[PDB]
């Protein structure tokens, strides 16, 4: 139903694009691009079409597009850890 994917910061970029966010018909962001050479692509495990439920355990429910993108960018840039955990689904979660 849902998968926790740990992306190690193996490259200088994360290399994903997301669409949607709160107050749209795609209320949780969906991954639309995974760029070769970036940390996400290097990880084996994210897919175009994955919906991001949580970033490092923080729900994205309620976060409009720009804010969801800001949180993900901060999770990548922070020196708090050398990885980002994405909770994702290919379908829907109850």
């Amino acid at each position: 139903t849902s998968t926790l994917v740990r992306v190690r910061k193996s490259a200088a970029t994360l290399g994903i694009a997301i669409e949607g966010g709160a107050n749209t018909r795609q209320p949780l962001p969906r991954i639309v691009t995974i760029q070769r050479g970036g940390s996400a692509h290097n990880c084996g495990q994210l897919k175009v079409g994955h919906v991001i439920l949580e970033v490092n355990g923080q729900t994205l429910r309620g976060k409009e597009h720009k804010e969801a993108a800001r949180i993900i960018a901060e999770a990548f840039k922070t020196k708090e850890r050398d990885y980002i955990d994405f909770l994702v689904t290919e379908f829907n979660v109850m």
Partner: peptide, 11 residues
């Protein structure tokens, strides 16, 4: 359309 952001381009 849905908004799209490339995370690496976030300022």
């Amino acid at each position: 359309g849905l908004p799209v952001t490339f995370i690496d381009e976030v300022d």
